[PDB]
Amino acid sequence: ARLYRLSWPTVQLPTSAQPPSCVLLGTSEVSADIQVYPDLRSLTAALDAGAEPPGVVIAPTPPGGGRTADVRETTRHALDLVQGWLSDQRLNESRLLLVTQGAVAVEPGEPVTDLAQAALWGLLRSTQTEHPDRFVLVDVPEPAQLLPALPGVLACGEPQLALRRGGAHAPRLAGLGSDDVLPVPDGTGWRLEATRPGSLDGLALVDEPTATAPLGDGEVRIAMRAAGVNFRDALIALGMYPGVASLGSEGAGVVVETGPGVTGLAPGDRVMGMIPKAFGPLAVADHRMVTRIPAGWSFARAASVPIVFLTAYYALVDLAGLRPGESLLVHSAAGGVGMAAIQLARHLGAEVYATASEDKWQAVELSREHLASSRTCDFEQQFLGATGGRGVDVVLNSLAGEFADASLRMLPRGGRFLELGKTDVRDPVEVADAHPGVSYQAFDTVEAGPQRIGEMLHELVELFEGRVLEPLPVTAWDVRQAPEALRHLSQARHVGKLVLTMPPVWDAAGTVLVTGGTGALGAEVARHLVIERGVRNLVLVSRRGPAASGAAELVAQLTAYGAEVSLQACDVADRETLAKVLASIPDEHPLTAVVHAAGVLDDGVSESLTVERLDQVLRPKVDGARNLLELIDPDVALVLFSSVSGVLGSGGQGNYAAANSFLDALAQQRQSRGLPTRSLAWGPWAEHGMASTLREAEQDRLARSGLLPISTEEGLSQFDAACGGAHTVVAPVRFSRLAIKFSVLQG
Ligand SMILES: NC(=O)C1=CN([C@@H]2O[C@H](COP(=O)(O)OP(=O)(O)OC[C@H]3O[C@@H](n4cnc5c(N)ncnc54)[C@H](OP(=O)(O)O)[C@@H]3O)[C@@H](O)[C@H]2O)C=CC1
Numbered sequence: 001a002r003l004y005r006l007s008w009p010t011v012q013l014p015t016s017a018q019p020p021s022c023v024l025l026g027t028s029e030v031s032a033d034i035q036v037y038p039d040l041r042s043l044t045a046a047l048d049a050g051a052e053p054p055g056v057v058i059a060p061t062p063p064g065g066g067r068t069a070d071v072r073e074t075t076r077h078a079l080d081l082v083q084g085w086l087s088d089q090r091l092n093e094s095r096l097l098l099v100t101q102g103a104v105a106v107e108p109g110e111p112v113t114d115l116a117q118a119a120l121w122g123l124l125r126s127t128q129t130e131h132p133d134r135f136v137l138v139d140v141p142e143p144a145q146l147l148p149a150l151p152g153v154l155a156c157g158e159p160q161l162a163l164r165r166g167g168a169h170a171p172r173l174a175g176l177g178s179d180d181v182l183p184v185p186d187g188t189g190w191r192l193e194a195t196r197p198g199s200l201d202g203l204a205l206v207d208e209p210t211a212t213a214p215l216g217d218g219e220v221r222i223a224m225r226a227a228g229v230n231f232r233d234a235l236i237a238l239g240m241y242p243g244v245a246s247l248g249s250e251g252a253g254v255v256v257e258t259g260p261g262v263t264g265l266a267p268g269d270r271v272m273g274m275i276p277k278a279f280g281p282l283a284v285a286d287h288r289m290v291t292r293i294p295a296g297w298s299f300a301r302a303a304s305v306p307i308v309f310l311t312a313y314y315a316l317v318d319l320a321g322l323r324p325g326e327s328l329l330v331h332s333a334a335g336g337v338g339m340a341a342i343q344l345a346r347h348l349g350a351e352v353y354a355t356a357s358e359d360k361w362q363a364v365e366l367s368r369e370h371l372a373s374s375r376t377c378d379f380e381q382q383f384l385g386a387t388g389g390r391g392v393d394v395v396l397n398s399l400a401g402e403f404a405d406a407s408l409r410m411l412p413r414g415g416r417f418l419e420l421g422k423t424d425v426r427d428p429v430e431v432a433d434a435h436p437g438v439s440y441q442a443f444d445t446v447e448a449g450p451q452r453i454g455e456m457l458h459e460l461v462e463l464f465e466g467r468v469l470e471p472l473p474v475t476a477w478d479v480r481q482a483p484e485a486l487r488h489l490s491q492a493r494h495v496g497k498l499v500l501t502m503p504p505v506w507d508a509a510g511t512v513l514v515t516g517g518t519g520a521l522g523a524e525v526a527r528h529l530v531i532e533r534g535v536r537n538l539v540l541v542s543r544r545g546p547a548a549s550g551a552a553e554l555v556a557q558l559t560a561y562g563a564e565v566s567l568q569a570c571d572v573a574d575r576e577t578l579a580k581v582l583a584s585i586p587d588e589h590p591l592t593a594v595v596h597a598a599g600v601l602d603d604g605v606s607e608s609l610t611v612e613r614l615d616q617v618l619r620p621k622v623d624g625a626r627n628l629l630e631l632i633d634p635d636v637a638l639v640l641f642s643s644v645s646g647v648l649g650s651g652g653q654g655n656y657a658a659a660n661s662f663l664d665a666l667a668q669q670r671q672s673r674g675l676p677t678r679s680l681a682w683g684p685w686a687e688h689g690m691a692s693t694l695r696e697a698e699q700d701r702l703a704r705s706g707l708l709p710i711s712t713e714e715g716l717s718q719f720d721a722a723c724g725g726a727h728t729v730v731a732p733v734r735f736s737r738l739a740i741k742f743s744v745l746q747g
């Protein structure tokens with residue numbers, strides 16, 4: 001039994017194949033000319049009144065969402081469509097092409113945006129297996145990509161694709177690896193450093209002495225959970241960073257050891273700052289250079305923050321002394337530092353002009369007017385054009401080389417100029433050479449010093465909680481996959497901040513909650529957690545709770561292995577009851593993990609499915625997972641159990657597979673946003689259940705009493721007879737052969 005991962009290789013679409021009849025199922029006009037019917041019904045009408053079955057109907061899906069209701073509407077809608085379609089049967093040899101936007105993660109940079117659409121994928125996948133060569137799934141992030149590609153989409157016979165500008169992608173299961181990604185020393189307190197600089201291959205995770213022991217000064221030791229990656233980190237990795245640097249500066253985590261020389265904050269504390277050599281389970285730094293963590297921030301959203309905002313602050317306050325009314329020019333706007341400055345600048349009451357690449361513009365919250373491409377030098381006369389020089393009072397430049405020159409001709413009036421880039425660094429007096437009026441400082445944030453950083457840290461937080469700065473968009477990765485992340489980073493595909501997360505680790509002190517801890521899997525996992533693993537505080541949770549056979553025994557067993565076990569009756573889909581449960585977890589064993597193993601089953605081809613059945617199967621998986629993530633503390637690890645059925649589209653379980661595909665998508669999106677989430681797509685288990693096991697046993701016991709099972713027809717004729725019949729107590733049974741075992745059975 002392998003573990004599998006679903007990949008999306010590029011495929012080649014046949015470029016010379018015949019373009020086919022097409023109708024559009026949609027609200028509105030088509031820029032192109034192709035038949036449009038607002039709904040399936042109307043396309044029937046045309047068929048009714050003579051029209052010839054189109055080879056392909058396109059059904060672009062209305063935008064979903066990641067909320068229960070969303071999932072509900074957009075699978076229900078998919079069902080009406082699938083059912084309407086199957087029942088016509090003039091629409092045979094014709095194919096329904098359902099289009100989605102962002103239901104599917106294909107490229108490294110990109111997360112699932114529409115969970116509900118991802119549910120759609122599962123359901124339809126099921127139906128595809130039920131009816132081959134009749135439906136086609138297409139994820140296309142911006143439509144009209146579609147039509148050009150359309151004769152190819154159809155000729156390749158492939159039922160599932162995602163269109164990206166890169167290419168067309170098909171999905172397939174793959175073994176883990178394939179190289180096996182990044183391997184860990186397991187001996188805790190390693191780190192990521194570039195071993196063979198020059199190339200991203202030859203990154204590795206090798207044990208680090210420095211982190212482990214001992215403190216300190218001065219110093220405080222941290223159990224890291226996430227860390228920010230900076231552009232710096234990507235150059236270091238490529239033997240292309242002009243200066244001294246150790247991979248990974250900044251992060252957030254939990255305090256382990258403190259002292260000597262430290263009083264302000266103490267162990268257990270959640271903390272973020274500018275840690276050196278950040279990319280490991282264990283690192284240690286100066287307690288003034290780090291600070292405790294605001295709102296209910298995730299460790300991930302904490303880790304993105306420090307470097308970018310310290311720079312922005314240290315740069316715009318200390319070095320620039322930016323005043324209200326004064327205006328600013330910032331490069332790499334949709335980047336972290338670029339992103340940060342514009343936020344802080346708007347607080348400091350400046351006008352702002354800035355630059356990123358055209359594809360990132362939407363992510364800037366700046367009036368069209370003030371924007372410009374960042375890999376050209378056009379901005380100059382457009383901005384100087386935009387405002388008569390004097391142009392900008394201050395410049396926070398990252399673009400070095402010759403892009404840095406067109407910069408300084410902004411702000412001719414005079415003013416201050418800040419350089420970030422070490423390659424082609426300059427001289428202040430020799431800068432005064434080129435332009436009059438302009439002072440010039442080339443800085444590193446660490447320059448401010450521990451004293452100043454801690455003071456800027458305390459001052460930034462204030463702003464964050466004042467709701468005046470908001471942490472950047474996070475796109476997260478697991479340290480073991482850093483190469484994929486740094487490649488992204490160095491290719492400048494991203495917006496906002498990238499972040500690395502450390503391998504998840506449950507507080508051995510803490511509580512673990514298993515939903516559906518009665519079920520075939522939940523019990524086993526429940527047992528394995530207590531009997532083999534650390535776990536010594538359990539909450540189990542199922543609709544019936546302790547009242548279902550044999551849950552009393554199930555508990556006994558564990559509590560007997562010396563554990564603090566609670567089994568509460570609770571429907572996970574009732575947020576009000578879940579809350580009641582979580583709250584009753586004791587303060588000293590606070591929960592660190594959820595195993596969402598709760599589930600309800602259905603069976604039937606998509607023809608036969610109904611809305612009411614759909615919701616049956618959705619309620620524990622979707623509402624439950626939503627309730628959980630809503631209620632759960634951010635950095636509680638969440639393990640969702642889906643089913644391989646959601647991935648193969650097992651058929652017979654359309655609607656179940658929808659639920660499971662949601663879970664798969666919820667994790668993929670959620671880990672991306674930084675939070676500790678993992679989703680396992682179980683194939684079949686041998687196990688059975690307390691259930692079940694107990695029903696089976698009853699059957700043995702009754703047999704072992706030389707009894708035999710009654711057919712249902714006979715059982716009901718007896719029901720009939722015994723109900724209205726003279727004897728008040730009556731044993732309708734079928735015996736076997738002609739029992740010295742039972743005294744009652746004599747004569
Ligand atoms: N000295 C110090 O203390 C610090 C220095 N820095 C420096 O500031 C810069 C910004 O850092 P950070 O915000 O973390 O990283 P960013 O997220 O800002 O990434 C850099 C961005 O610059 C843009 N860019 C412009 N020209 C190019 C190019 N030719 N190739 C690739 N990208 C380009 C890219 O986006 P776009 O498509 O919009 O151009 C890219 O996203 C880094 O280079 C870093 O070295 C950062 C922090 C501290």
Ligand SMILES: NC(=O)C1=CN([C@@H]2O[C@H](COP(=O)(O)OP(=O)(O)OC[C@H]3O[C@@H](n4cnc5c(N)ncnc54)[C@H](OP(=O)(O)O)[C@@H]3O)[C@@H](O)[C@H]2O)C=CC1
Nearest residue numbers: 516518519520521542543544571572598599620641643685
């Ligand atoms: N076992 C297998 O062969 C496979 C399992 N899986 C995955 O494993 C999971 C478990 O399968 P299995 O253990 O056999 O399922 P079971 O039906 O045997 O157990 C399901 C458990 O979930 C509980 N439950 C159902 N709905 C709720 C609810 N709304 N609130 C609280 N508890 C609820 C049920 O308790 P009660 O009804 O008493 O409330 C029961 O305890 C499945 O959901 C699926 O994700 C995937 C493929 C195959």
